[PDB]
Amino acid sequence: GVQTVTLIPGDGIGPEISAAVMKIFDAAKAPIQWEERNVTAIQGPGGKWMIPSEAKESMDKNKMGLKGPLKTPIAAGHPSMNLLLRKTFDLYANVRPCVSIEGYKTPYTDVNIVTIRENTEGEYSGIEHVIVDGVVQSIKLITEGASKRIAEFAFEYARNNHRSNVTAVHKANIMRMSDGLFLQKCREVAESCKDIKFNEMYLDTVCLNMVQDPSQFDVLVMPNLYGDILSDLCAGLIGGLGVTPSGNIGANGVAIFESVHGTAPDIAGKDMANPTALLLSAVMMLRHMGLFDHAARIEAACFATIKDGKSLTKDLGGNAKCSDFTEEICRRVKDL
Amino acid sequence: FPVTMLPGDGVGPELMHAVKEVFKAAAVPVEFQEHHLEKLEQVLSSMKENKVAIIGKSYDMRLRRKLDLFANVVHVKSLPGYMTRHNNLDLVIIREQTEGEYSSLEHESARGVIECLKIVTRAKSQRIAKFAFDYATKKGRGKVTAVHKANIMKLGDGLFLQCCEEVAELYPKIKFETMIIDNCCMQLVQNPYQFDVLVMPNLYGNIIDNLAAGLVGGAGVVPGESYSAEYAVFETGARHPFAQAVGRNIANPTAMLLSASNMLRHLNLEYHSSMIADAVKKVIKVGKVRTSDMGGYATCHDFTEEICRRVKDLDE
Ligand SMILES: [Ca+2]
Incomplete structure (x- = not known):
């Protein structure tokens, strides 16, 4: 019926862009209800090694999680905030699809890469x-166990998302x-799924190749x-x-889709933030949850709003405010 | 006058062939002591006497070990005719070449639990930060950016980044920035013009050499140098496994000839260095002959033959 998603707005522009994602979802009448939590690490018994229990408990029930940008902590011993999030939910796969946006003129067109990182x-x-x-x-x-796990994940992801090739990136020389x-655990999985075409390239060679001609890559899995x-x-x-969207798959069907950009507090609170990162991640989330028909529309309208060019935020070169951008996508999906 | 010549793997022998031909065309007064591929001692003594070499490609690094070629310089500089998604670029990549994960320190601590050691020491950290700032001034460069992942590898990169900041104070004329590698990699492909001189472990x-090389036209054109306290060996800048081992009479000599010109400028025959360099850059600009890697249809000696035709004409 209706799915409850754990929502971590974070710091800086985070609560602005997460309200945008909520409203746009409501605009597309998506069966998503939000449960707002914060994950800033509390000082554990004698140190600082844990996130709030209500966060843990909520993500364990809801399984799906949408995470905005997080301030880098300044506390003395404070660890990386994504480190804690990685360890407590065993987020072993970090998926990052990179597809050129039709409305965004960049020197690279026709790129469709998915990097699967251990x-x-x-x-x-x-x-x-x-x-x-x-x-x-x-x-x-x-x-061996971690490699096989990520290798196994990469091939499964190629199967479910109709990608033809997996390329294993390494520096085994x-x-x-x-x-x-x-490499050898990647090969073992590869032999089990021959419907996916599999090769190996060296990291250095890939970077050279990626910068020249990125059309030659599909999914890439690497340490x-x-x-x-x-x-x-x-x-x-x-x-x-x-x-760029970004998801993180962990244990117990737990997945946390996130924006990877900075908290950017120089424009924080000024209605100037670009929420397409978080939103595209929220599309992955909706696809991960099976809401393909809701995802297809939301993603389709965001792509349109950018190809149009009327409503663009300062960072992408436009003059308009986040609110205007968010509203055009809302008004664009409603007729869909 | 005397230079040690190591032809190396794959097309290396073919590439160095082109260098000798151009040098004969330009009447370059250097005699090459070809040493083909223990055997390193003979080469080592050649280096001790000559102090300068040109080379193709714990494998060969034990050579770098022996001659203490701790610093690697790579010049990424767009060529006027050769058009890429990034033009008018000019950076230099200074890379410490002996430490890190390159010494083959690996073991099994349990079944299927492989452990791999990465070493970095204050000695070599400083040594390359000093080298980097020396380079930047001795060549007129504005700033040097230190690339690192010190928020994750706090002790290792942290020790590297620290030494960098210590040497950065003795060179106040040169701006000093620091950038994290995963960001510095994104920045090189969006806007590489923000960078001047990079220094890294x-x-x-290895990552930025080959990523930068793609920005400018690929392994076929990007040259490099590795310096010791006494020696200077000249080679190509993009050294990934499939750099140019694939082919015969197809390879692009542009990278080594420009490296050979740099070697002549090191030998202070700054005349022939500038002639050969100019001969190479203009042949590219006119765009008549271009090897396949540059989108042309031209054999390797076709390119080499025309380069000499141009360089012999400059001589007379
Ligand atoms: Ca990153």
Whole structure:
């Protein structure tokens, strides 16, 4: 009947753009009800290692979550806010589709990349050691179970979203044991799903290739660090972090779709924020939930409002206010 | 006069062939001691005597080890005729070349739990930040940006970024910025013109070298250099596995000849350096002969032959 989504508006422009997403959803009469929570880490017993229980509990019930931009904490020992969110819900896959927006003139047209990044291991592991004076050691660890899990996820995502190819990105010529095991677990999944065409490329080669001719890529799966940087590279191909959606799949059917751009508080509260990032993420969310007919319209109207050009926000080069932008999309979906 | 020549893998021997031909055409007064591919000692002593080499492509890094080629310089600079989605670009990528995850420190701590060590030390961190600022002034560059992921790798990159900020104060004439790698990568493809001189650790230099090279025209045209405290070896800038090992008489010599000109400018035969450089850049601009990688239909010696025709005509 009606689905309740956990909604984390966050900081800065976040509550502005999340009201836009709510109103636009209401405009399209989407069976979505919102449950507003905040996730700013509270100081746990003797430290700071936990998010609010009401947040945990709400996301465990609702399974779906929409997250705006979060302020970078300034507390002394405070950890990364997405780190905590990653550990408490075991968000192991970070999906980032990059498709050129027809109404946004960029030097790259006709790009349709999905980067599947492993979010739990890799160079982004907690382990770092001072070995002796002025000599620091950082631990990258690859496990078989985590690799197979992300590999398995990448192929499943190609199946459900009708993508023809999976490409495994690695540097196994340098890190032959660690990345090698990522490659070989990717290969094992690949042999099980021969309906998906599978290849392997080297990270460095991909970046060179991506910048020249991005039309040659479909889905790309890779260990943590490579994903973190190559996902921002492809973003820069279509417009930047203002227009890229991003989801995070975790354990127990928990998924948190998020905007990845800054909290940008220099325009905060001035009705000038561009909410298309969050909204496109909310489309992924609606697609993840099976509301394809609601997603198709909402996504279709946002694409239109941009191709039109009348209503555009300062950041995309236009002069209009968020409120105007949000209203055109609302008025555009109602007749749909 | 004497230069050590390592032809290397794949088309390396073919590429270096073109360099010798151009040098004969330009009457360049350098004799190359070809060493083909333990064996490193012979090369090492050649370097100790010559102090300058040109090379193609724990594999070869043990060479970098031995000759302490700690700094890698890559010039990304759009060529006037060769048109790309990013024109009029001019950056230089300084990359520390010996540390990081490149020493093959890897083990199994449990079944299917591989652990991989990344090392970074204060010695080499400083050494490249100093080198970077030296470079920037000695070439007139405005600012240098230090690329890092110090919000995640707090100890390692943090130690790198710290040394950078320590050297940045002894060079007040040059602006100093810091940028996080995943952002710095996005920025290079939206607007690369905000950058001047980049300095990074080993792995990030592998990413940005090849990403930057694509901005300017690809592995076929982007040159590079690696410096020691005494030696200077000249090579290509984009060194990804499939850089140009694919083909025969198809490869684009543009990258090595421009690297060979840079080598001559290091040898202070700044005459031939500027001649060969100009010969290469104009042949490209006129746009008659262009190899396949540049969207033309031209064999490698076709390009090389016309380059010499132009360079011999400049001589007379
Ligand atoms: Ca990122």
